[PDB]
Design a protein around this nucleic acid. Structure first.
Ligand code: MG
Ligand code: MG
Ligand code: MG
Ligand code: ZN
Length: 592
RNA sequence: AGCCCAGCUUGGCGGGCGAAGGCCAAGACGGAGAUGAGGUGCGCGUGGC
DNA sequence: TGCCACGCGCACCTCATCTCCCAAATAGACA
DNA sequence: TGTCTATTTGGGAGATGAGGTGCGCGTGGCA
């Protein structure tokens, strides 16, 4: 029963966001901002509690001095790098910088120890501050829901999300990595939640309950026209799409104490099992190219799938090397031959034996992403030209009032986002001057290019993601066991730009290719499919695998020879591919 | 040429250029939140040139 | 066998991991 | 006065710590 899942329904594009929904999203954003402000104040108060002790104060002073020295040396290193116009500077500067950084790290560790020794004596004060924070959070519910128009489900969703975020931040800071809460800017996107409570001894919240007009949750969430998945899968796609158009009635908070409901015309492609247990739903609103889209996600608790027992073992390895037919994003090997559909044979390549292959991404995705980049360049150039023309007209002509104030060239000149120019075009749409035409002929055009720059991009990414899911599907259809390497793409991405031996532009191109390939997404999709379909997954400790030659079992030195393929070995004196060897070593390690 | 026209990806037919108008076929489908990174684009400085 | 340009400013996007997906007590609307 | 519906609430916990990142894992060809 534990297996959670989400079924999504796409609201009709000919549906305008009601005012109640907009107010609900605004209230949710304000509530999260208030929560973040409270959390930051609480953090500052805790740090003030820590700084009260004398030993911690002395450690803080030492750490501050060390940080000042480190930042000064970093500034000098940056200046020397700028002067030399390269990354090769005097070795003395690097040694001074390393020594300063080591001293700073030691001072920070000393501060941590000073906190640790006096940790037990501040427990009462920290508990008191935590109680004050909880009281303020309760007052937020009093203000936003008891005396406000925010639905209690949305408040609870936001509060739970925030508490999970602070738990994650504390866990990260415990390891030694930086993390902090940040203020986001509202734009019109958000989420509104509905919760289906089930008390002790209550009947399951099956999908058949939600379809009833007079059900237990008729005034919380109503999804009419539920069809059994077995019957649903027999119908033709025409009937499935005609019958899947329903009108979901959803609670949408209050308005001056008066509860309100919204009717979303949604299109449903799949239904939930008759034994599901709907735990809740959420309507998510997003802006893509300044256009609002809505989607209703319903969460259900379904039973688990019996694990598989037989099947070939498939080992997967991640890379982002470049090939004439696209980026080769993965390399897979199998213990027994696999069966790949013919429609995927150009993406999930296989060998004659059927036990090995490479997963590559079509070059059309990269071409479309490059097209989006070109569109962005053209948009920026046109925006700059418009800025120049508007500033000139403002200087040489009279300034009609904008935002109930005269327009000053200092403000217009420093405008950088296109949102300001779009707003000025809207306000002066009926201005009647000439700068109202020049400022509209731009905006209209920019409303067509912008969409493309976003829309096409999404398509490309979607295409890639789709293919990945397809690939994952086939593996879960046959594999009795799947092995994945423990490569951390995030750590590599974070540390790549600082210790690269290549020029900045080459590393930028490599990182862009890695981002477009998205190896981590492919691995995540494979793991998710295996988990859903009951296939076991094993994360292999992949340390020292590309430096090991499978045929001879010798470990080559890390002399950066692995920057190209094939790679020369020292034990046997032969050139070997470092990814076939990787997957072979993974299979050997697992099959032991 | 692109983007859009009942969820998403890929195709076919018929349309729209910020508005219109949808129909059909195959496939896959676990979402949200936060954080941390990365990338692109346009300007500026410094040089080499 | 050595080289490929080093830093800012803002604006606007995606990628990589990780967690979580409630229910009891109390109050109201109705007959 | 008694069934269902809707909202309020307390969780859920025991409670140090933020600036990574040299372990590998990935990624270079051109003159
Ligand atoms: Mg490899
Ligand atoms: Mg569509
Ligand atoms: Mg057409
Ligand atoms: Zn060898």
């Amino acid at each position: 029963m534990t297996t959670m899942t989400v079924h999504t329904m796409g609201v009709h594009y000919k549906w305008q966001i009601p005012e109640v929904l907009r107010q609900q999203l605004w209230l949710a954003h304000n509530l999260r901002e208030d929560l973040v402000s409270l959390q930051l104040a609480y953090d500052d108060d805790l740090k003030a509690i820590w700084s009260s002790y004398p030993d911690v104060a002395q450690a803080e002073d030492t750490m501050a001095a060390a940080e000042a020295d480190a930042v000064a040396l970093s500034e000098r290193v940056k200046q020397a790098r700028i002067e030399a116009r390269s990354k090769k500077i005097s070795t003395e500067l690097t040694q001074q910088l390393r020594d300063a950084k080591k001293r700073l790290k030691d001072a920070r560790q000393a501060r941590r120890d000073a906190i640790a020794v006096v940790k037990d004596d501040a427990a009462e004060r920290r508990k008191a501050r935590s109680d004050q924070l909880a009281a303020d959070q309760k007052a937020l519910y009093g203000q936003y829901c008891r005396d406000g128009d925010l639905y209690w489900a949305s408040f609870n969703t936001v509060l739970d999300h925030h508490k999970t975020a602070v738990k994650r931040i504390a866990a990260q800071r415990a390891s030694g990595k930086p993390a902090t809460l940040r203020h986001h800017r509202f734009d019109g996107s958000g989420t509104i939640a509905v919760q289906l409570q089930r008390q002790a001894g209550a009947p399951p919240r099956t999908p058949m309950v939600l379809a009833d007009e007079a059900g237990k949750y008729r005034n919380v969430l109503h999804i009419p026209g539920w069809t059994d998945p077995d019957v649903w899968e027999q119908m033709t796609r025409s009937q499935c799409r005609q019958s899947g158009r329903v009108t979901v009635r959803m609670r949408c908070g209050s308005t001056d104490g008066q509860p309100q409901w919204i009717d979303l015309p949604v299109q449903v492609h799949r239904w939930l099992p008759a034994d599901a247990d709907i735990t809740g739903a959420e309507l998510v609103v997003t802006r893509v190219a300044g256009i609002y889209r809505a989607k209703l996600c319903v969460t259900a608790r379904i039973g688990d799938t019996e694990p598989v027992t037989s099947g070939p073992t498939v080992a997967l390895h991640l890379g982002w090397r470049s090939t004439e037919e696209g980026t080769a994003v993965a390399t897979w090997r199998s213990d027994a031959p696999l069966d790949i559909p013919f429609g995927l044979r150009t993406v999930m390549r296989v060998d004659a034996a059927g036990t090995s292959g490479i997963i590559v991404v079509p070059a059309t995705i990269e071409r479309r992403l490059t097209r989006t980049e070109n569109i962005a360049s053209s948009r920026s150039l046109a925006l700059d030209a418009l800025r120049d023309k508007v500033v000139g007209w403002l200087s040489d002509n009279d300034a009609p009032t904008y935002r109930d104030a005269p327009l000053e060239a200092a403000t217009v000149k420093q405008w950088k986002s296109p949102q300001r120019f779009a707003s000025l075009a809207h306000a002066w749409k009926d201005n009647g001057t000439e700068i109202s035409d020049i400022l509209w002929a731009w905006f209209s055009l920019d409303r067509k290019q912008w969409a493309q720059q976003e829309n096409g991009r999404r398509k490309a990414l979607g295409h890639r993601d789709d293919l990945y899911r397809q690939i994952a599907a086939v593996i879960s259809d046959q594999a009795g066991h799947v092995l994945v390497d423990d490569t951390s793409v995030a750590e590599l991405s974070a540390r790549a730009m600082e210790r690269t031996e290549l020029p900045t532009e080459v590393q930028q191109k490599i990182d862009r290719r890695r981002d477009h390939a998205a190896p981590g997404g492919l691995r995540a999709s494979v793991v998710a499919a295996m988990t859903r379909d009951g296939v076991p997954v094993t994360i292999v400790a992949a340390a020292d695998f590309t430096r090991t030659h499978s045929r001879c079992g010798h470990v080559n030195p890390a002399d950066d020879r692995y920057l190209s393929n094939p790679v020369r070995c020292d034990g046997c004196g032969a050139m070997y591919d470092q990814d076939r060897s990787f997957v072979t070593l993974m299979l050997r390690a697992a099959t032991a």
